[PDB]
Design a protein around this ligand. Sequence first.
Ligand code: HEM
Length: 154
Amino acid sequence: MVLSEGEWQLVLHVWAKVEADVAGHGQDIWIRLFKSHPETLEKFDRFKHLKTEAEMKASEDLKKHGVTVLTALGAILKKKGHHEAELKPLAQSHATKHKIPIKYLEFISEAIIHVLHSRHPGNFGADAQGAMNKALELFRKDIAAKYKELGYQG
Ligand code: HEM
């Protein structure tokens, strides 16, 4: 797929608000994911033991990890499609070490969209959401392709 410059602009416009509080957005997203699709929490030997939302909120480790994830994703979005180098190390670890199915990347995509919709209604109307969804689909398609080359696909 290819986004237009206008679609990238909508994406990087909301993302700039997200970057006002990276750790707080990281928290909401992971907590949204873990509550909605609890099976995803099983992938983290680090976080598996967390029983409640209150425990998740209070985990300093989880908050650091959310900042690591959103900074990696932010660096990809700012490439505006030219993200091949960034994608390589991320595809290799998630396919080969962590073993994360494309399905789970769809689930977190959903969690990111939910959280931007709640926090940023003014900057996340239908068009901006359409553009963010396009950007994350692009991300998933390219990652899926890399999975396949690395011998995991799926
Ligand atoms: C927007 C999508 C994602 C991004 C950009 C991302 C990024 C990262 C980064 C940058 C790291 C640290 C370096 C590395 O191991 O590659 C990491 C580690 C990890 N990621 Fe992700 N990730 C994403 C989605 C997911 C999902 C959906 C799962 C599982 C449901 C997953 C599970 C893990 C695991 C298990 C680790 C290791 C955590 C640890 O013990 O430190 N990732 N991820």
